[PDB]
Design a protein around this nucleic acid. Structure first.
Ligand SMILES: [Zn+2]
Ligand SMILES: [Zn+2]
Length: 684
RNA sequence: GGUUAUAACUGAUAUAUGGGGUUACAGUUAAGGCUCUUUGAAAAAAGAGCCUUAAUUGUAAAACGCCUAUACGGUGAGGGUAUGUACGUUUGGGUUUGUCCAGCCUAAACCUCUACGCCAGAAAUGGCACCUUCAUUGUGGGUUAGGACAA
DNA sequence: TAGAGGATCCCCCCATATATCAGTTATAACCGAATT
DNA sequence: AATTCCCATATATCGGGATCCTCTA
């Protein structure tokens, strides 16, 4: 064990860690891990909820300020009605809720701020009011309560010292002198002058000019995405428990992910070198400008005129299920086509692109996605290619900190090299079971010596327990699972969609197109439910599909806005109990953190009894009363607690609380869960 | 090979909004039911009341809590505004708990680093905004749907 | 008539600006250490 | 003092409950 080498295979969702010794190429430890993949969705979803909450708070402040001013100038406000009785004041208050957008100048639910202001001004003028009041009202509409601060944010530290890195927009003079030091390299200097310069220097103002010949340190990485950061931490967690206390580390290698994102994103393998400089976007333009040029500044879906003030970059492939922000996934949507699509497949949406602009597109990738949105699934580009490539740094530094040896050697191995040895030593790369990642890790750590006559040497084969080569299904341990725990204080208290609880039944309103096929029995209406079933049978729609906009209109499901929009139906919500219902203010939500543990106590008679402990943060918000603890509690059960049955010696892990906890064996059981009452269960 | 620079390419974190949708309440309309009164031999019809299901209008709520009233806004009158001020520096605080952190927000004291936006002239910079003082009049403000460890 | 086993049920969407970093591809500049 | 830069198409692809119907002592 003189030389120990650890091989790490970094992947988008699975990472394989293996450590072997180069003395005889013997496998000492090999295990693949599974990283959390819901962090990106959770972080994105949290931001939307936070933005919506802050947006509503600003609306309340704007409405309160407008109401106070309206009352001052002669308005009468009634608390019961909540709005002014006078028509000029009532209209202004009503228009304040939807003030429109003002991020672009003027060249429909959301039309513009100017149109709303013009509508506001017209109703104020008709009310015989002074221009001073109109100006003040307009100022309230355009008033900003929370100022935007995007300048001076996320300051970069210098490579040598800790001083703040100056912004590149005040460095344009310095960057010009960096090229004139030496000596087609003629258009390079033009770029710094006449375009945006986003990105810090990674250096301060005293080392960048003259001390640029400081090539002694690695590229420091200070900022990492939380989803990518927790993926590395989960991998490092496995290393600390097993690799750290068992064996020492002398060398570490990693699989370099040269996915060629600039090449696989266009539906090709590797385009020309000269075509890498010029991307899909037009020269001297943005994504919106480039999208309009390919559509001739019109709309693909409806053909109406599109300007920069209303152009939307739609995702032909919805982001609700999949969705990738590529140039070939966004074409055009002006005001209503985006609203009608609302994040669903165009084939399922039914708003087919007009066959007059598709033939005018010069991009071959756009042809396939528009004809069939499902083609992106068969594309050779995935979001995990960037996930695997991004994050190779900030891992060696953390590895060096954990295991010491700040002078650790870092090497990168390409996937082509490990493929040669895998197919030559007698290994098969199966796209099925995930145990094949530990083997990539072993080939990553294995000594590479061809010798012989140009063929891979057979005496350097990795060894199993004693000499039995390396078997994925025989010489591997259990692959670790990293999941999300909802028992913490950071988990959501309830669902984001309020529910209606009238006459002791949980119901909610759902769109006709949003109703899944085969689940129409929940509709309370005895006439629209039959109509929905008839439409499904007539059009020949299987289970799991929806109704398109054209099909819904032709089936009489469009009597919402003068025959120009789909309606909504009130249907009962399945898979919900009374204990999950919590009422906050006038809203009612369904919760999932209502159970925090199982408490077992002694009854008055003497027999043991089990109850469910409720969340302290939601105890007073429960619609129905719960059951408390009467006798003395002997023990309290919790999630992730190793328990055993009264008539068995196996170890089980509790997954669900309640009077009948659900338990599952740590090793084995083929993933099947076991349900048993807590009375006949004991905690180990 | 490393570092850095210029293009481009995806990946994912904050920020500030524009909508759709959901729920509560209060009106209106349509259709379908249940009762009462009444026209009526009867058939039947009308009026009134209630319910259900759709369409429509307005208003309101959207995590619990914790912290802050020594706080947080409106109006009017002064001053300060690259010599300045914080999105910056230094030491802290709130969220914040069994413990620690992220992300936001913020106090006192300071310009070494970092950043400093809009609307208007014919060189003279004016308004807005920001900061601050005072008076008057209100009850507001921040954070919270993420990650670890421990019980 | 009570509790497990076994079906199937349940979760919010679109977009517009404003900033930033972290990876890849290409070209160019050097720096540097190994290799020849 | 001139040259190499590890050998040498591949790598990446809910959880925590709930009801309903069916068995079992
Ligand atoms: Zn420096
Ligand atoms: Zn359109």
């Amino acid at each position: 064990e003189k030389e120990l080498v650890l091989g790490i295979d970094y992947g988008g969702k699975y990472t394989g860690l293996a450590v072997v010794n180069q003395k005889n190429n013997q496998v000492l430890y090999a295990r693949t891990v599974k990283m959390r993949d819901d962090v990106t969705d959770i972080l994105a979803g949290r931001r939307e909820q936070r933005s919506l909450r802050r947006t509503l708070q600003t609306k309340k402040k704007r409405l309160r300020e407008l109401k106070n001013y309206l009352e001052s100038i002669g308005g009468i406000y009634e608390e019961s009605s909540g709005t002014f009785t006078i028509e000029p004041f009532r209209t202004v208050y009503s228009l304040a809720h939807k003030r429109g957008y003002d991020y672009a100048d003027l060249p429909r639910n959301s039309r513009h701020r100017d149109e709303v202001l013009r509508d506001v001004r017209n109703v104020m003028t008709e009310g015989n009011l002074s221009e001073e009041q109109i100006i003040k009202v307009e100022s309230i509409f355009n008033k900003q309560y929370r100022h935007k601060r995007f300048n001076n944010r996320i300051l970069t530290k210098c490579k040598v010292c800790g001083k703040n890195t100056p912004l590149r927009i005040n460095v344009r003079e310095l960057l010009l002198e960096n090229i004139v030091r030496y000596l087609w390299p003629g258009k390079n200097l033009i770029d710094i002058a006449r375009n945006q310069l986003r990105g810090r220097l990674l250096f301060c103002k005293v080392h960048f000019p003259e001390n640029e010949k400081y090539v002694s340190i690695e590229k420091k990485t200070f900022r990492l995405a939380p989803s990518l950061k927790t993926k590395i931490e989960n991998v490092l967690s496995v290393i600390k428990d097993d690799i750290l206390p068992n064996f020492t580390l002398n060398n570490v290698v990693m699989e370099s992910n040269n996915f060629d994102i600039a090449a696989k994103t266009k539906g090709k393998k590797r385009l020309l070198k000269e075509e890498y400089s010029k991307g899909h976007r037009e020269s001297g333009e943005t994504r919106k400008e480039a999208l309009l040029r390919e559509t001739d500044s019109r709309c693909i879906y409806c053909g109406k005129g599109i300007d920069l003030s209303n152009a939307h970059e739609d995702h032909i492939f919805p982001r609700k299920a999949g969705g990738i922000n590529i140039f070939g996934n966004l074409v055009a949507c002006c005001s209503v086509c985006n609203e009608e699509k609302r994040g669903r497949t165009p084939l399922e949406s039914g708003i087919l692109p007009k066959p007059e602009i598709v033939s005018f597109i010069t991009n071959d990738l756009k042809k396939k996605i528009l004809e069939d949105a499902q083609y992106i699934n068969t594309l050779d580009f995935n979001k995990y290619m960037s996930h695997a490539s991004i994050g190779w740094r900030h891992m060696r530094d953390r590895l060096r900190e954990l295991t010491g040896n700040k002078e650790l050697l870092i090497k990168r191995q390409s996937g082509i090299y490990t493929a040669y040895f895998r197919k030559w030593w007698g290994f098969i790369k199966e796209r099925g079971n995930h145990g094949h990642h530990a083997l990539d890790a072993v080939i990553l750590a294995s000594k590479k010596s061809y010798a012989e006559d140009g063929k891979v040497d057979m005496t350097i084969k990795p060894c199993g327990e004693d000499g039995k080569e390396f078997d994925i299904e025989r010489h591997l341990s259990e692959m670790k699972e990293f999941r999300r725990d909802k028992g913490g204080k950071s988990a959501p208290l309830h669902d984001r969609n309020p529910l209606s609880f009238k006459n002791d039944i949980i119901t909610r309103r759902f769109m006709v197109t949003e109703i899944e096929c085969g689940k129409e029995a929940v509709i309370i209406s005895e006439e629209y439910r039959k109509k929905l079933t008839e439409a499904f049978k007539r059009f020949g729609i299987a289970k799991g599909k929806y109704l398109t906009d054209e099909q819904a209109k032709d089936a009489g499901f469009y009597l919402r806005k003068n025959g120009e929009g789909v309606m909504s139906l009130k249907c009962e919500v399945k898979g919900t109990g009374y204990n999950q219902m919590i009422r906050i203010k006038n809203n009612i939500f369904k919760t999932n953190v209502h159970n925090v543990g199982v408490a077992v106590f002694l009854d008055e008679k003497g027999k043991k009894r089990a109850c469910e402990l409720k969340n302290p943060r939601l105890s007073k918000h429960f619609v129905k009363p719960a059951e408390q603890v009467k006798g003395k509690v002997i023990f309290i059960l919790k999630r992730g607690n190793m328990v055993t049955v009264e008539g068995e010696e196996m170890i089980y892990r509790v997954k669900k609380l309640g009077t009948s906890p659900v338990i599952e064996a740590i090793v084995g059981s083929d993933g099947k869960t076991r349900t048993v009452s807590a009375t006949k269960l004991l905690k180990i």
